[PDB]
């Protein structure tokens, strides 16, 4: 029935920034304090920053600042590092023992551009007798997210038999990596010679190209 | 001071699920616990708290499906009833302080899948790259594993670098758009002596067993040598088409660098005798060249049987092939139908129906392929293969699990084929036989010691009487289920009676009755009492006690 | 009164397949325009000659034309089958003394081999390729039921049987 | 004291001839000269006698057509007129004390002939035997000329030897049956040194001229006129019978003594251009090795033209020649060719082959079926059977008996059948294997009463790691052959490692076994010893 | 017109023997002897035995007996020689200057028996240029002159392609000697591996072969 509106859900500001995260509550919280504000990333548990809609949690640093009463509260994140880019929640809880999150907020932070690390690797001789054929281009360690990844087999471009894997934002450069799988058949790999990978970066001035040679390794 | 979360799997829609919060550290008469879920790309959702006291409460939306209890003193069990695909979540479990869920320690999250896709295995190949492209100042290369085709969600890999340090990057999962289930890789870069270093990735599955674990163990490198090319050739007919009275068949190797090379001669595909053949190498300069020769009756080359030479070469393995040659090539697609094998039945209690459908001419396109019911009932998600064969052919494998209550009450499947370059689809049709049934009778014997013999014995097993003619023959040695391929099994015939009537026979080595003399023939089929399976023993040391 | 004539003269033909259905009789009335009706219903064909490309299932069943005459024309039936063997015929009823050619066709011009033809269960006649028995007359012993066996692209496949009878000449 | 006849020549029909006998010793005025002919083949013959008066006096068939004449005090001439071939003979003439031919001083006699061919001179070979025939001791050696193709005679034929002593013979003349021209041989013994000795004979035909001399200068020993083995071998199409874009055709000489060799590629018998293929040559101990490839289109490899492989070593030709092959089936038709049962061969000692033709058409014009063998020796009669099949097909069925020993020693049986609607002959050819041997082991078992089935039993009998695959089994019950239709036997399946192995299977009623309670499970199998067969008995008995 | 018969045309007895020669004319000759008996081998002049019907010539041996008168003659040969092998002829002088030969009658002896001595001879190279190739067989020094000699062409009996000569009797041992010369075309030669000749003989006990294969000498 009650609600947790959390506005933003999405915010961008650079290294040193600050940002603002609201949540706005339909009814007031038991005892006009008693919400939480949490830090997520991808793969992990929640880590609480503020408990209490204004006390900082223990190992939180002090750049998390909490406020707000009633049914209004803000947390605000100041001097913001490449650490603190996650997706940040609140907690509300009622009476009648009722706990409702928040919608949650993807914060996005602007650092420095790094170039990709390319690599390709060609597929198994253990997946060769499987009828399969994956071909992996690796793009290791590139800051920022955008990047283009295309498939040259015998000079040809392919479509709709590549995917792509991207990981998290890093917890200490914050950088990226990205791979993309050329899946192919047993014919479809055997008929051609030259698989090549190029990849396209802000980064780079030009695209990249990692190749090689089926049979001539 | 921690928590756990365990019980997290793949189960079907409507299933019951409990889940297990383990902690550690704290007691849970001071501290109550939460449960908290969170579906994929969705963000964070209470479900509810159990307080010291044994209180449960939950959120709105539970509506009675939640439940919480306190098995013991350490563990919080959760249990959810009437699920559907909206609950594929990772669950946390967490200590709280107070009815509030404000709290600081959390366990890392166990993950439920609700879906209708078969639980596979993943298959994990080396990801290494080309040593050529790979500099020879490396100080630090990065490598991989890819555990590619499982499902469902997840597998984790380890790492074994031996002594050398390694940082391990595991990429998410990517879902197939084919198939539907998931693929990973996971990157190791270690740095120092990497060449002469024996990598092994750990990935382990748990939707599969607990227990499933592959190790797959490689070395970083993919130069080999400078390739071989292997061609065919043959004996001409004469001057009036004839064909002479044997024919020969020269396998040739070109030049590569030299190295322990084998030719093996398949007719097709099974492994030949290698007295027929010979064999030569020469080497010229820095290379080396590789003759085989094969000679055959005229009646085998007029038999329209494939041979393939197959060359072993540093590891890797080379191919060609050939048949009797023809001007022109008809062949239409055929298609068969198999019954489930009484031990999927009845031991395994997993039968299945497989659609063969071979021969046909790789057109443009994929061909159509359906399972149904007579009766209307839903049929199970069927597998598929496509493999191009070494004649020519595209050969097509549709393996469908079929209800094991279902085909003993005598239900029907088809098997329906449809082409757009067909005249007509292709039907088949299978069924539980209609007729009675009589039960194996099983006698099991031993050839006797001779000249010759002292290390290698023949064992023979005799399955008779039987009704209906689908019968499964497996022998049994201290304790394991010996391969299929270790033995060899006639096709059924008619008795002069009544019954239908197998052989099997099986080769057996001297270190296995030493290790154990008792072998087991056993028959799996439907009419034998009470279990559908019969079996006896058999000693091979069956001593000779003269006038008893 | 018009007859109707088809060209191919085959009654059965294959999914997929053309005919041109022509329609003539008698110049007593100069001919204008023709009715066509596959089952009864009227089509929306003027012209003499009517075309049926690319044959569905719904193409079956029977046909008829008529002129500006009085009268209308005989119930020609057209079956289309989708299958490996065809053994098609020239007509369905026959008075003696006319050709009758008997073809076991197979399906997009592909090659028949091994071909046998039945009549009545025995075998009338076999030949390594696909072959055109041509019997220009027509005993009243030769009324049956025919059938024929065949390879196709090495498989064998059997014809749907049809049933041919024969007629005295005179009543 | 002798005489001596001239003037014998070949003359053609009409042309008058004049011989010239020659005396020495005694005197005219003294003596008579008879003339006296013999035909080749009959008997003597005379024609006349001259006195020392002049006067000649002739036979009764001569007619005025024969003339003597004396000439000088030491020659006689006789002139002889309208002649024909009957007066081919050769002419003596003699030394009469009388007017009878009673006399014992006779010329040698000249050969007059009467032909019409042409006049051909002899074409000379040496005639030496092979040398590693020749033994290496050989204390004497015989060697010879052919001197053939000529017309008329004669040849005469001398003899170089070098420093020995040495015997000639020179063997009388033989007329060519097709071309009517005459061949001799001339042979030559020696002894010692007659490895390195170089030996000649002199060949000369006074009919085409008088100074026709053909010395004919070898040697009895060399090197073995070489012969080096060509082969053809081809290119594959694929695994789905298809042809690749070009032919490769390799032909080899393997295994000769080194010498000058040149390749040459024909297509339907013309010489195609050099650069076309490549030859290369190795050499391995003694023996040489010589290989050529070609490289053809698809299109003309599909032409059905005839590529031939000529080799010429040491100026000599050795052939071989190809074609697109014939697939077996020209109309659709197949043909089966056996080979016989073992226990046909071995135990019956009847051993036959059938050839078994099917789908043809019921046509008109019977098929034409014929038998034979790769080296020619002859064949039996068949079985010749026809019969039409229940769905409209004819197929026609032969059995020929065959030889037990033949079939062992690995000849090859070939059946040929002609139809007069197939394009061509088809062709099925059967022989004995070329893998190893490996006799058959037998192991024969009763199977344990079953509760229930007190009246019947099962025996079981395993034959296993045989080479080749061509079995017989029996089994036998009171020293008879129980009907093959009592017992099911699988067909020939390989084993894990060398060989094959069937099963056989026995049903049995309480009557047999308490008739007689062994029964035998034999084997015939070619690789069995000593007479290609070996069985196991076995009861349903126990210990006790 | 007057006839002169001889008889018999063959006559054989062995070595010691006597053989008896008969002529009868159907008119009597001159002074009722004059009558020749003659010896002639192959490729000789004959020889003259007897003289006036009773006379023995000069030379002759004592062995040889003419006897007869008016129309019948004889000649005896008593004490039979290997060498006395040869064709007989008688001689008839009449009236009118008239003089007639006999028939003539071929007397043959038997003598101890020689096993032939086989040789094979394959064609000379200078023939194989000439598209024929004649394959010799040769017989040496053999007793009594009947012998068959039989070819084989890939064990196949050869017939109507070869043809023998035979030489007449020696003068010192008696013997004779036989060639038999097989004659075939240069594409029926090239077709053929294994060349074959079998002498079957009296003094054999088996027809001895002797073969050889094409090349290998
Ligand atoms: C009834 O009888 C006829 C026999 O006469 C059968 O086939 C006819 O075939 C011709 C040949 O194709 C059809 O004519 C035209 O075909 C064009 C394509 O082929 C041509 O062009 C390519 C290059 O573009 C060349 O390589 C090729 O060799 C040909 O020269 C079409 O583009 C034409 O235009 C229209 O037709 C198509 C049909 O799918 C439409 O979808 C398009 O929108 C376009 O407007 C043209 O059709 C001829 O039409 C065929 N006849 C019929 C009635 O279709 C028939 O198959 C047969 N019917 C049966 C067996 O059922
Ligand atoms: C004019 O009148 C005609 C006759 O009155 C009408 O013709 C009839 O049309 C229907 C539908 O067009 C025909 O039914 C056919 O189609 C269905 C579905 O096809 C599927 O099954 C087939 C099995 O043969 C497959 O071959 C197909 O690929 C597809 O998968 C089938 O149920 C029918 O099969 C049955 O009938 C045939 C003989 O026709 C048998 O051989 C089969 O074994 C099975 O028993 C048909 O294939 C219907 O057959 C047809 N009537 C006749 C007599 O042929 C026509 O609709 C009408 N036209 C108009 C415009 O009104
Ligand atoms: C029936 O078969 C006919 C084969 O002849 C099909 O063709 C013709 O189609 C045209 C246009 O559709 C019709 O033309 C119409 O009628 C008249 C006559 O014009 C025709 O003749 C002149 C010469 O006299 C010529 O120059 C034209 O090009 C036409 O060929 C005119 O008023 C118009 O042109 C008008 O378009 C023809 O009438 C028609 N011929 C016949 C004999 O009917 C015709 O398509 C088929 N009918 C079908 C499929 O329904
Ligand atoms: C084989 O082929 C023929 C055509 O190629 C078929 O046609 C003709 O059929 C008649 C049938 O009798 C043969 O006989 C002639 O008959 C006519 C007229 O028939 C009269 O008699 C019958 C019998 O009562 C009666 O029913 C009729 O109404 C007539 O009154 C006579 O005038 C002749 O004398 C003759 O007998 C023809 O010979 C035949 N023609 C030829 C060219 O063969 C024939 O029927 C076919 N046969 C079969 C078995 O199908
Ligand atoms: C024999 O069976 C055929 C069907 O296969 C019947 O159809 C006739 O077949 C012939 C030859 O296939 C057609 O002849 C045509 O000749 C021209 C000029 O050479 C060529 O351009 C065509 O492609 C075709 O070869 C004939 O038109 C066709 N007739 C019909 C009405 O379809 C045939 O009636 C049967 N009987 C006989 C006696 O041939
Ligand atoms: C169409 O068929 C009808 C069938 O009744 C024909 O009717 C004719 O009617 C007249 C008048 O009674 C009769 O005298 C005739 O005997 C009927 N039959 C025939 C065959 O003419 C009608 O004429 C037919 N139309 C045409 C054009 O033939
Ligand atoms: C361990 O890693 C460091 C980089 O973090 C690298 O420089 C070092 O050489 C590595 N040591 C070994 C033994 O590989
Ligand atoms: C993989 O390696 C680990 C590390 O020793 C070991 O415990 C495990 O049993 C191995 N698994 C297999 C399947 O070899
Ligand atoms: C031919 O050989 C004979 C035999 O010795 C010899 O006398 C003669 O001179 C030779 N001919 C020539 C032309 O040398
Ligand atoms: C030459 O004469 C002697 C004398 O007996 C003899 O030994 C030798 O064999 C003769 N040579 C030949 C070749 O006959």
């Known amino acids: 029935e009650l609600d947790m509106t959390q506005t933003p859900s999405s915010v961008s500001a650079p290294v040193g920034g600050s940002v603002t995260i609201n949540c706005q509550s339909s009814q007031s919280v038991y005892g006009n304090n008693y919400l939480a504000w949490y830090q997520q990333k991808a793969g992990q548990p929640p880590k609480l920053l503020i408990y209490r809609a204004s006390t900082l949690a223990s190992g939180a640093p002090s750049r998390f600042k909490g406020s707000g009463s009633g049914t209004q509260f803000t947390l605000t994140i100041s001097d913001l590092e490449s650490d603190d880019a996650a997706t940040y929640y609140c907690?509300?809880?009622?009476?009648?023992?009722?706990?409702?999150f928040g919608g949650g907020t993807n914060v996005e932070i602007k650092r420095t551009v790094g170039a990709p690390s390319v690599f390709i690797f060609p597929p198994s001789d253990e997946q060769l007798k499987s009828g399969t054929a994956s071909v992996v281009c690796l793009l290791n360690n590139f800051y920022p997210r955008e990047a283009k990844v295309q498939w040259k087999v015998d000079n040809a471009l392919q479509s709709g038999n590549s995917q792509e894997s991207v990981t998290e934002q890093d917890s200490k450069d914050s950088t990226y990596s990205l791979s993309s799988t050329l899946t192919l058949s047993k014919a479809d790999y055997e008929k051609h010679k030259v698989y090549a990978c190029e990849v396209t970066h802000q980064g780079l001035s030009s695209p990249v190209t990692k190749s090689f040679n089926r049979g001539e390794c | 001071q921690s928590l756990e979360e365990s019980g997290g799997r793949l189960v079907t829609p409507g299933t019951p699920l409990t889940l297990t919060c383990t902690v550690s550290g704290f007691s849970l008469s001071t501290y109550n616990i939460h449960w908290v879920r969170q579906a994929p790309g969705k963000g964070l959702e209470w479900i509810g708290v159990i307080d010291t006291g044994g209180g449960t409460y939950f959120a709105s939306w539970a509506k009675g499906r939640f439940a919480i209890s306190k098995t013991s003193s350490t563990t919080v069990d959760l249990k959810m009833t009437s699920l559907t695909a909206a609950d594929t979540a990772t669950y946390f479990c967490?200590?709280?302080?107070?009815?509030?869920?404000?709290?600081?320690?959390w366990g890392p999250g166990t993950l439920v899948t609700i879906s209708s896709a078969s639980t596979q295995s993943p298959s994990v190949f080396p990801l290494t790259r080309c040593c050529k492209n790979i500099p020879s100042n490396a100080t630090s290369v990065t490598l991989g594993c890819l555990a590619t085709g499982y499902f469902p969600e997840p597998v984790m890999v380890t790492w074994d670098t031996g002594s050398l340090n390694g940082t391990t990057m595991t990429l998410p999962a990517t879902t197939l758009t084919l198939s539907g289930h998931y693929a990973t890789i996971s990157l190791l870069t270690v740095s120092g002596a990497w060449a002469k270093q024996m990598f092994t990735c750990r990935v382990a599955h748990t939707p599969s067993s607990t227990d499933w674990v592959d190790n797959k163990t490689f070395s970083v490198c993919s130069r080999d040598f400078t390739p071989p090319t292997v061609k065919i050739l043959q004996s001409s007919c004469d001057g009036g088409g004839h064909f002479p009275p044997t024919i020969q068949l020269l396998c040739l190797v070109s030049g590569y660098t030299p190295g322990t090379i084998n030719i093996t001669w398949l007719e097709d595909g099974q492994v030949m005798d290698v007295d027929l053949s010979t064999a030569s190498t020469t080497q010229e300069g820095e290379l080396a060249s590789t003759q085989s020769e094969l000679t055959l009756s005229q009646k085998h080359w007029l038999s329209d049987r494939t041979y393939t030479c197959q060359v072993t070469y540093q590891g890797h393995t080379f191919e060609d092939s050939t048949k009797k040659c023809a001007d022109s090539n008809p062949r239409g697609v055929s298609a068969y139908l198999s019954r489930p094998s009484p031990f999927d039945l009845f031991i395994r209690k997993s039968p299945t129906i497989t659609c063969l459908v071979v021969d046909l001419a790789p057109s443009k396109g994929t061909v159509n392929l359906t399972w149904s019911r007579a009766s209307g009932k839903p049929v199970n998600h069927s597998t598929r293969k496509e493999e191009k064969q070494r004649n020519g052919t595209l050969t097509v494998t549709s393996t469908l699990p079929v209800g094991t209550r279902d085909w003993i009450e005598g239900e029907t499947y088809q098997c329906r084929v449809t082409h757009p370059h067909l005249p007509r689809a292709l039907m088949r049709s299978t069924t539980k036989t209609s007729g009675p049934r009589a039960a194996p009778e099983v006698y099991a014997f031993a050839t006797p010691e001779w000249p010759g013999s002292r290390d290698k014995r023949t064992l023979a097993c005799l399955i008779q009487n039987f009704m209906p003619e689908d019968i499964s023959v497996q022998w049994l040695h201290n304790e394991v289920q010996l391969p299929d391929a270790r033995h060899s099994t006639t096709q059924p015939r008619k008795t002069k009676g009544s019954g239908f009537f197998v052989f099997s026979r099986l080769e057996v080595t001297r270190a296995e009755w030493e290790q154990k003399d008792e072998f087991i023939c056993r028959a799996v089929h439907e009419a034998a009492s009470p279990s559908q399976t019969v079996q006896r023993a058999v000693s091979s040391v069956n001593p000779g006690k003269h006038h008893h | 009164k018009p007859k109707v004539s088809l060209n191919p003269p085959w009654n059965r033909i294959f999914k997929g397949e053309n005919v041109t259905l022509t329609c003539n009789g008698n110049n007593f009335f100069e001919v204008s325009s023709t009715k066509w009706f596959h089952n009864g219903s009227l089509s929306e064909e003027t012209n003499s000659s009517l075309n049926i490309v690319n044959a569905k299932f719904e193409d079956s069943g029977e046909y008829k034309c008529q002129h500006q005459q009085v009268n209308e024309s005989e119930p020609v039936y057209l079956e289309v089958f989708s299958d490996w063997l065809l053994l098609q015929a020239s007509a369905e009823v026959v008075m003696e003394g006319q050709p009758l050619f008997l073809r076991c066709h197979g399906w997009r011009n592909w090659d028949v081999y091994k071909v046998i033809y039945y009549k009545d269960g025995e075998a009338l006649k076999y030949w390594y390729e696909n072959h055109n028995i041509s019997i220009t007359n027509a005993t009243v012993e030769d009324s049956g039921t025919y059938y024929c066996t065949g390879k196709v692209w090495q498989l064998d496949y059997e014809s749907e049987p049809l049933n041919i009878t024969v007629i005295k000449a005179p009543r | 004291q002798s005489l001596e006849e001239s003037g014998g020549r070949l003359v053609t029909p009409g042309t008058p001839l004049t011989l010239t006998c020659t005396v020495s010793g005694f005197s005219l005025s003294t003596y008579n000269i008879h003339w006296v002919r013999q035909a080749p083949g009959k008997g003597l013959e005379w024609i006349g006698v001259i006195d020392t008066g002049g006067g000649t006096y002739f036979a009764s068939w001569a007619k005025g057509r024969f003339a003597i004449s004396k000439t000088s005090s030491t020659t006689v001439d006789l002139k002889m007129t309208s002649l024909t071939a009957a007066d081919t003979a050769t002419?003596?003439?003699?030394?009469?004390?009388?007017?009878?031919?009673?006399?014992?001083?006779?010329?040698?006699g000249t050969l007059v002939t009467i032909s019409s061919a042409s006049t051909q001179s002899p074409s000379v070979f040496p005639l030496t035997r092979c040398c590693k025939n020749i033994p290496s001791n050989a204390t004497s050696v015989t060697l010879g000329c052919l001197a053939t193709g000529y017309f008329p005679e004669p040849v005469m034929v001398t003899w170089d030897t070098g420093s020995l002593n040495g015997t000639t013979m020179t063997l009388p003349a033989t007329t060519l049956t097709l071309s009517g021209h005459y061949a001799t041989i001339s042979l030559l013994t020696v002894s010692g040194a007659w490895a390195k000795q170089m030996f000649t004979c002199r060949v000369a035909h006074t009919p085409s001229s008088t100074d026709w001399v053909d010395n004919k200068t070898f040697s009895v020993c060399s090197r073995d006129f070489t012969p080096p083995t060509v082969k053809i071998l081809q290119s594959s199409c694929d695994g789905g019978g298809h042809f690749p874009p070009t032919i490769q055709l390799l032909c080899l000489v393997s295994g000769y003594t080194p010498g000058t060799i040149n390749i040459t590629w024909l297509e339907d018998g013309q010489v195609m251009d050099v650069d076309l293929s490549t030859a290369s040559t190795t050499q391995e101990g003694e023996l040489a090795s010589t290989q050529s490839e070609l490289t053809l289109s698809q299109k003309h490899w599909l032409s059905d033209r005839t590529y031939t492989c000529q080799v010429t070593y040491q100026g000599h030709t050795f052939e071989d020649s190809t074609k697109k092959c014939a697939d077996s089936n020209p109309r659709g038709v197949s043909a089966y060719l056996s080979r016989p049962s073992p226990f046909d061969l071995f135990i019956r000692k009847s051993p036959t082959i059938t050839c078994l033709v099917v789908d043809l058409a019921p046509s008109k014009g019977t098929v034409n079926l014929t038998w034979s063998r790769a080296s020619g020796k002859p064949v039996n009669h068949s079985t010749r059977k026809e019969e039409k099949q229940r769905n409209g097909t004819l197929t026609v069925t032969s059995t020929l008996p065959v030889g037990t020993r033949d079939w062992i020693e690995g000849e090859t049986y070939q059946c040929r059948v002609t139809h007069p609607h197939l394009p061509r002959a088809l062709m099925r050819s059967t022989t004995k294997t070329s893998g190893p041997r490996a006799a058959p082991e037998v192991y024969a078992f009763a199977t344990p009463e079953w509760p229930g089935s007190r009246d019947k039993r099962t025996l079981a009998c395993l034959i296993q790691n045989f080479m080749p695959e061509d079995i017989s089994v029996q089994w036998l019950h009171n020293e008879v052959q129980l009907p093959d239709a009592r017992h099911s036997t699988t067909q020939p399946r390989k084993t894990k490692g060398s060989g094959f192995f069937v099963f056989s299977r026995l049903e049995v009623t309480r009557a047999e076994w308490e008739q007689k309670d062994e029964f035998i499970c034999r084997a015939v199998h070619e690789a069995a010893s000593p007479s290609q067969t070996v069985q196991r008995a076995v009861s349903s008995v126990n210990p006790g | 017109e007057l006839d002169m018969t001889q008889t018999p045309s063959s006559v054989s007895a062995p070595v010691g023997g006597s053989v008896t020669i008969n002529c009868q004319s159907s008119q009597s000759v001159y002074g009722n002897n004059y009558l020749a008996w003659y010896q002639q081998k192959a490729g000789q002049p004959p020889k003259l035995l007897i003289y006036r019907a009773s006379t023995l010539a000069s030379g002759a041996p004592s062995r040889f007996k003419g006897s007869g008168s008016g129309t019948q003659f004889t000649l005896t040969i008593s004490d039979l020689e290997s060498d006395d092998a040869a064709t007989?002829?008688?001689?008839?002088?009449?009236?009118?200057?008239?003089?007639?030969?006999?028939?003539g009658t071929n007397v043959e002896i038997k003598r101890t028996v020689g096993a032939p001595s086989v040789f094979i001879f394959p064609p000379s190279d200078e023939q194989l240029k000439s598209g024929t190739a004649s394959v010799v067989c040769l017989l040496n020094n053999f007793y009594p002159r009947e012998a068959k000699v039989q070819w084989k062409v890939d064990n196949a009996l050869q017939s109507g392609n070869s043809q023998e000569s035979v030489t007449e009797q020696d003068s010192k041992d008696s013997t004779y000697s036989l060639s038999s010369t097989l004659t075939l075309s240069k594409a029926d030669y090239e077709k053929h591996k294994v060349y074959a000749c079998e002498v079957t003989h009296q003094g054999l006990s088996s027809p001895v072969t002797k073969s050889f294969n094409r090349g290998e000498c």
């Open positions: 907690l509300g809880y009622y009476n009648g023992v009722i706990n409702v």
């Open positions: 967490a200590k709280g302080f107070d009815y509030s869920a404000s709290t600081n320690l």
